[PDB]
Amino acid sequence: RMAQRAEGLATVLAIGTAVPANCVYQATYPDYYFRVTKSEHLADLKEKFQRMCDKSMIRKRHMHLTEEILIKNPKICAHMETSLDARHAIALVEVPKLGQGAAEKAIKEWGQPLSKITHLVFCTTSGVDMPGADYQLTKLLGLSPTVKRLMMYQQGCFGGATVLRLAKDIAENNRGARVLVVCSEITAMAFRGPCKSHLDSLVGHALFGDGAAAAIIGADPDQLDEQPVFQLVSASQTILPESEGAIDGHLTEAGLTIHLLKDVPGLISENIEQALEDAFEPLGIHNWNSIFWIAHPGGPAILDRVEDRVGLDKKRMRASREVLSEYGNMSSASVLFVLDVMRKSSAKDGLATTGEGKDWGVLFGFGPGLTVETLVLHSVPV
Amino acid sequence: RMAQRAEGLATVLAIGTAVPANCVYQATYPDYYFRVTKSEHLADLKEKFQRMCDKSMIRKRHMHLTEEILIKNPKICAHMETSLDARHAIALVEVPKLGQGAAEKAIKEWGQPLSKITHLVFCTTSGVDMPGADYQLTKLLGLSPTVKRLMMYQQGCFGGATVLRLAKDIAENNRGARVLVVCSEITAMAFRGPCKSHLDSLVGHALFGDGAAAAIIGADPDQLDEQPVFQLVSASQTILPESEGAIDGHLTEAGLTIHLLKDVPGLISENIEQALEDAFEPLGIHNWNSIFWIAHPGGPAILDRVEDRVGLDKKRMRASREVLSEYGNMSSASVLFVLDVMRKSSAKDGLATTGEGKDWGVLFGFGPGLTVETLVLHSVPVP
Ligand SMILES: CC(C)(COP(=O)(O)OP(=O)(O)OC[C@H]1O[C@@H](n2cnc3c(N)ncnc32)[C@H](O)[C@@H]1OP(=O)(O)O)[C@@H](O)C(=O)NCCC(=O)NCCS
Ligand SMILES: CC(C)(COP(=O)(O)OP(=O)(O)OC[C@H]1O[C@@H](n2cnc3c(N)ncnc32)[C@H](O)[C@@H]1OP(=O)(O)O)[C@@H](O)C(=O)NCCC(=O)NCCS
Ligand SMILES: O=C1C[C@@H](c2ccc(O)c(O)c2)Oc2cc(O)cc(O)c21
Ligand SMILES: O=C1C[C@@H](c2ccc(O)c(O)c2)Oc2cc(O)cc(O)c21
DSSP: OTSOOSSOOEEEEEEEEEESSSSEEEHHHHHHHHHHTTTTTHHHHHHHHHHHHHOOOOOOEEEEEEEHHHHOOOOHHSSSSOOOOHHHHHHHHHHHHHHHHHHHHHHHHHOOOGGGGOEEEEESSOOOSOOOHHHHHHHHHTTTTTEEEEEEOOTTTHHHHHHHHHHHHHHHTTOOOEEEEEEEEEETTTTTOTTTHHHHHHHHHBBBBBEEEEEEESSOOTTTTTOOOEEEEEEEEEEOOTTTTSSEEEEETTTTEEEEEETTHHHHOOOOOHHHHEEEEEEEEGOOOSEEEEEEEEEHHHHHHHHHTTTTTTTHHHHHHHHHHHHOGGGGGGGOOOOOOHHHHHHTTOOOBBTTTTTOOOOOOEETTEEEHHHHHEOOBO | OOTTTTOOOEEEEEEEEOSSEEEEGGGGHHHHHHHTTTTTTTTTHHHHHHHHHSSSOOOOEOOOOOHHHTOOOOOHHSSSSSSHHHHHHHHHHHHHHHHHHHHEEEEEEEEOGGGGGGGGEEOOSOOOSSHHHHHHHHHHHHTTTOOOEEOOOOOOOTHHHHHHHHHHHHHHHHHTOOOEEEEEEGGGTTOOOTTTTTTTHHHHHHOOOOEEEEEEESSSOOOTTTSSSSEEEEEEEETTTTOTTTTTEEEEEEEEEEEEEHHHHHHHTHHHHHHHHHHHHTTTTTOTSSSEEEEEOOOHHHHHHHHHHHTTTTTTTTTHHHHHHHHOOOOOHHHHHHHHHHHHHHHHHTOBBTTTTTTEEEEEEEEEEEEEEEEEEEEEEEO
């Protein structure tokens, strides 16, 4: 046992990302969306959608779904028609394929042979199948058949935090263990026509985009061969009081359907300081401007209300807001995009650490429950 | 870090199980199945199904699905009609509820307060939802809102092995950590009428039953308060060569569909010796009759072919075959039923350990990939 376990902290050794090539600009999206769903006669609905897109703080999203795919699948353009099989035909292929894109880039940065990967954690909100996307990606990359797999299906936007909590325990309990984590999301599971009865669906079509992110996680990194980017210090999870039904996601005959309440920004902002204190008081840290921030960019209102309630300088949420701006909400993938933006912008602006010159960092995932996942991170020098 | 980690091996401290009260005897099942699915005109198919049930070595299965629910959901009795929403309406409620049945029993055996549960791992092959069955069970039991949850959806028959591998890393890496693992399966997601084009579906309807199992796992058990049942020593996983497509499961508009190939018993039995060697060589163990066996009772053919290829005395597979006989194939839940049957029958037969008087044990999960999961277990003494 004592020799079978690793000594040091789980560490991010590499981060890769990938998006579908197809790029849709938010400025023109209300016109595109109402046109391709043949709903331009719903003028009030379109005006309401225009206001959502205008306040979204999203410049662009990447989307596998094109007009050509939508023309060949009219049932996906309707609001609530039988479409799961046509959606699965796309997503069961594209999720592992996008995850392969991200995984290759993480593996290239890491630079070790594929044989060294002992574990794979695959996380999606975008379809389910047996064998899983974990199997499909093992085959796509040529991992060892003895790779130990965890397939995290139907996770939602805290899935990015969940895979790091998982990778943490695996890497730290297994000497030599190197964990590939991959989060991959394709909105083709959820894309539908607008309807006046489901205004929360409209909000989802303003925010959700496609992407995948991959990291290599290991404890006791090699001095010459491996380059630490972040350390994973602790992982917590909580269900917020009075939050029942705030975020529901159903996999139906009509595909993936979302049920968002307007209260979500309020519920998270009202509970975030208790989450900070439970994570940081044991480390004697109390100044929320003295830590770097990896906040799941769920939407501008979440970031705004957390920033306001906690008292953050605008710089703290910059990396989260860049991911929201450049990619939208990519569910489980987003927080790894934020981590990657933060370490790259920190090096480019010649700061002292991978976390904007600070030592300690917080990573937040938010999703159904309502669930808040809190990870304490530690930066490494540049 | 050296402070936040536990010292000893992840240990099973309690096991509870639960099944739907509705009990379907296999002897009469061909008549029930062909009748409730209004398929009595398919005489050849029914004769083939009669032979499958007769060779199944299953005496009974528990099924949430009753005739009354089938009459109110005709689309589920068809082979391949749009039915996912009706299936989900049953399974998204009954999976957590059956898991709560098993979890309550494990928690009663354990005897510690619910507040001591730090982590929950929920596994199913029976429907998906957000929030998950993990959330629903947290609510049903009244676990702490700070419980750290892993929701293992669409896992298949190796899920029972997977949750123990997960609990092992969590319990050993987190001082004080007590992990509730729950596997819960409801065949309402998969139940359908027979079709001459899908004979593997027929095999499923002969073997799969409903059930849930729960265990409490922790490292460094408390000397006065907690009594170990098994230790989790190692966990391995492999994709068998030349096995692509052997076991597929699709969640469709028509519910969960299975795609089994006849080679499955062959593929597993041909690779099991290498899996035993990879797990036990490092411990210097070579005699497969000197260890206790927790084999996923996927079907009589898998147990028969492994027993023959490995050279096992009939005694080794007794606990696996009892679970098959008394419950059928309960997917991810089955191996925990087998662990529970082994420790209970070992105490009843006044044997020296929880593993039929042996010290070392092997637990196998099998499922899509084709994936074989191999855990080394260690028994504990029995007074
Ligand atoms: C939608 C959003 C991007 C812009 O809205 P905003 O900054 O609050 O500005 P407004 O109040 O002008 O809202 C614009 C429109 O969206 C509507 N809206 C916002 N959230 C909504 C919700 N959950 N359900 C329904 N409508 C909603 C408003 O009613 C308004 O419609 P109207 O102008 O026709 O009355 C912002 O509300 C947001 O960040 N919310 C989503 C956060 C969230 O729930 N994330 C989920 C992660 S799973
Ligand atoms: C189903 C089972 C109980 C039948 O008993 P058996 O000893 O194989 O007996 P038989 O070979 O006579 O099988 C009975 C019938 O089932 C058919 N059958 C068996 N496996 C089949 C499969 N995978 N697909 C289609 N038909 C199958 C046989 O061809 C035969 O049809 P017939 O009687 O008209 O000739 C047995 O095959 C079994 O245990 N299967 C292994 C379990 C499995 O593959 N899945 C595990 C769950 S993941
Ligand atoms: O309902 C959903 C949609 C889902 C999603 C799917 C595919 C994507 O590419 C994507 O960006 C998002 O995201 C969700 C995330 C949640 O936290 C809750 C949900 O209900 C949903
Ligand atoms: O397709 C399936 C069915 C599934 C199952 C669901 C619900 C139950 O109660 C149950 O006992 C089984 O079991 C499977 C197990 C597998 O390993 C693969 C599958 O495709 C399936």
